[PDB]
Design a protein around this ligand. Structure first.
Ligand SMILES: *C(=O)[C@@H](NC(=O)[C@H](N)c1ccccc1)[C@@H]1N[C@@H](C(=O)O)C(C)(C)S1
Length: 348
């Protein structure tokens, strides 16, 4: 119980990447229009298309009139690559335009290429939003132009950040790039913390919300540890960055993340009744990391209970059959599902 810092913003969250532990939070479930932070999910979707080899970096995309000054009034004086209809631009360039420059026209040109239309692309964004448990998130645009019925929260942004990092790492990697050059002009990354001396920050996106102020979703690493911070509705650009750096620095200073039960590791083996095998391996799967105050590892204790007195087949990989309890000094700090690590079908 280290005292959480004061944060000079509307809402915030600080989350450990490996354990999911929420180290600090304020109004983290309050709904706000995510505006430019939407492009985190745009990039998630494009990243999935690339990872699935449905599109390739080298593919040449034809820019449509929906991607233009003239032919889309909604792009009017937003951040833009200055694409024109009939332009041919690589997926790689449009991708960097979304990620590094946050260009709204690039989002549209990519969305059309990936999904056929903005509308079908927004469908994919919301599909993933549901899949990732972003329970307070709905996207209504491919570019995050403020829009009716478009909402997210600090919590959901940190979960989405975590997913981008974990699920499409090649796409995440582009978020630390300080510049890229298109049409022979350098376009800088607006994430000032990429230049921070005091932290290794490698992502991920800035924005504003009408009526709330300046936002940042950031992530940083220090040794084995990665933290994700979200700061929403800071009053100034300076505060937006500073309060983020404060939270990240605080997390690494006072906490450590350890993984007592590795993924794939067997925590305990239990007899099974009526199965094709007489025993089954149980473990934590991906949920075996915990974040604790520094110096506490020596006092960390892992134990288990089973929900039923005896396991009976069939058992499936991932099935929950009890709870793993982590205790610090006799006191329980974390519980996780005890899961089946291997299939055991019914005998016979
Ligand atoms: C995303 O949220 C963007 N914000 C806007 O497009 C706003 N409509 C806007 C705010 C202030 C001035 C002009 C437009 C991008 N995020 C901003 C930021 O992080 O400060 C931006 C100005 C770089 S554009």
């Amino acid at each position: 119980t280290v005292e959480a810092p004061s944060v000079d913003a509307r809402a915030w969250i600080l989350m450990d990447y490996a354990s999911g532990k929420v180290l600090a939070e304020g109004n983290a479930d309050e709904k706000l229009d995510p505006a430019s932070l939407t492009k985190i999910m745009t990039s998630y979707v494009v990243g999935q298309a690339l990872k699935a080899d449905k599109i390739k970096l080298t593919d040449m995309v034809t820019v449509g009139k929906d991607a233009w000054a003239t032919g889309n009034p909604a792009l009017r004086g937003s951040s833009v690559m200055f694409l024109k209809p009939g332009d041919q631009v690589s997926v790689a360039d449009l991708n960097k335009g979304v990620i590094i420059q946050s260009g709204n026209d690039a989002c549209i040109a990519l969305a059309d290429y990936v999904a056929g239309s903005q509308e079908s692309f927004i469908g994919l964004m919301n599909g993933y939003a549901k899949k990732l448990g972003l329970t307070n998130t709905t996207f209504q645009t491919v570019h995050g132009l403020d829009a009716p019925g478009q909402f997210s929260t600090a919590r959901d942004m940190a979960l989405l950040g975590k997913a981008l990092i974990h699920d499409v790492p090649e796409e995440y990697a582009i978020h630390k790039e300080k510049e890229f050059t298109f049409n022979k002009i350098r376009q800088p990354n607006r994430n000032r913390l990429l230049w921070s001396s005091n932290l290794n920050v490698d992502g991920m996106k800035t924005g504003t919300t009408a009526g709330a102020g300046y936002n940042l979703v950031a992530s940083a690493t220090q040794g084995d540890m990665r933290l994700i911070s979200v700061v929403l509705g800071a009053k100034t650009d300076r505060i937006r960055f500073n309060e983020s750096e404060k939270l990240l620095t605080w997390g690494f200073r006072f906490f450590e993340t350890v993984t007592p039960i590795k993924p794939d590791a067997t925590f305990v083996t239990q007899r099974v009744w009526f199965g094709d095998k007489s025993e089954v391996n149980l473990g934590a799967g991906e949920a075996g990391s915990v974040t604790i105050p520094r110096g506490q590892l020596k006092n960390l204790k892992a134990s288990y209970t089973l929900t039923e007195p005896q396991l009976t087949a069939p058992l499936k990989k991932g099935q929950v059959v009890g709870t793993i309890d982590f205790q610090l000094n006799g006191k329980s700090i974390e519980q996780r599902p005890l899961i089946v690590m291997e299939n055991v079908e019914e005998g016979g």
